[PDB]
């Protein structure tokens, strides 16, 4: 586990606009602090829909393809300490569960976003940077920039994955 | 399936 960077190293998108970040995004890159065993099945692209509600939370629905069937994951992101930051969950961690901090590093709303997450699940800590696109196409100059940003947070290139584009389940 | 984000 590479240690998570201090939040002073993680930019926050200026003048974040929640109603423009709304909608469907594909997970087109991920860089995270664990592992990566080459002896596996390739990680398939999935989609996340951020639906902004009048109470300024997002209802966040992911859809993806397993082996044979579609899967869904639904949860709420609530505004954090400043615009572009969120935490997981309406009520803070019930019985035994997951907590997360979310910071939108950069977005232009109609093409891509880079979003930093720190997560605890079953007392285990991890972090990732997720690269989102409004379309599935990922070109080389954006792959290069995502690798550079990931390296700036302490992650080397072997911890960076560009999920395989697929048609099942996600559109 | 949901290997990124939260």
From Swiss-Prot, chain A:
<dbReference type="GO" id="GO:0045087">
    <property type="term" value="P:innate immune response"/>
</dbReference>
<dbReference type="GO" id="GO:0010046">
    <property type="term" value="P:response to mycotoxin"/>
</dbReference>
<dbReference type="GO" id="GO:1904373">
    <property type="term" value="P:response to kainic acid"/>
</dbReference>
<dbReference type="GO" id="GO:1903981">
    <property type="term" value="F:enterobactin binding"/>
</dbReference>
<feature type="binding site">
    <location>
        <position position="128"/>
    </location>
    <ligand>
        <name>a carboxymycobactin</name>
    </ligand>
</feature>
<feature type="binding site">
    <location>
        <position position="119"/>
    </location>
    <ligand>
        <name>a carboxymycobactin</name>
    </ligand>
</feature>
<dbReference type="GO" id="GO:0071481">
    <property type="term" value="P:cellular response to X-ray"/>
</dbReference>
<dbReference type="GO" id="GO:0006953">
    <property type="term" value="P:acute-phase response"/>
</dbReference>
<dbReference type="GO" id="GO:0002020">
    <property type="term" value="F:protease binding"/>
</dbReference>
<keyword id="KW-0325">Glycoprotein</keyword>
<dbReference type="GO" id="GO:0071222">
    <property type="term" value="P:cellular response to lipopolysaccharide"/>
</dbReference>
<dbReference type="GO" id="GO:1904440">
    <property type="term" value="P:positive regulation of iron ion import across plasma membrane"/>
</dbReference>
<feature type="binding site">
    <location>
        <position position="132"/>
    </location>
    <ligand>
        <name>a carboxymycobactin</name>
    </ligand>
</feature>
<dbReference type="GO" id="GO:0005576">
    <property type="term" value="C:extracellular region"/>
</dbReference>
<keyword id="KW-0964">Secreted</keyword>
<dbReference type="GO" id="GO:0097192">
    <property type="term" value="P:extrinsic apoptotic signaling pathway in absence of ligand"/>
</dbReference>
<dbReference type="GO" id="GO:0070062">
    <property type="term" value="C:extracellular exosome"/>
</dbReference>
<keyword id="KW-1015">Disulfide bond</keyword>
<dbReference type="GO" id="GO:0110091">
    <property type="term" value="P:negative regulation of hippocampal neuron apoptotic process"/>
</dbReference>
<dbReference type="GO" id="GO:0071354">
    <property type="term" value="P:cellular response to interleukin-6"/>
</dbReference>
<dbReference type="GO" id="GO:0042802">
    <property type="term" value="F:identical protein binding"/>
</dbReference>
<dbReference type="GO" id="GO:0009750">
    <property type="term" value="P:response to fructose"/>
</dbReference>
UniProtKB/Swiss-Prot annotation, chain B:
<feature type="site" description="Cleavage; by theta-secretase">
    <location>
        <begin position="2"/>
        <end position="3"/>
    </location>
</feature>
<protein>
    <recommendedName>
        <fullName>P3(40)</fullName>
    </recommendedName>
</protein>
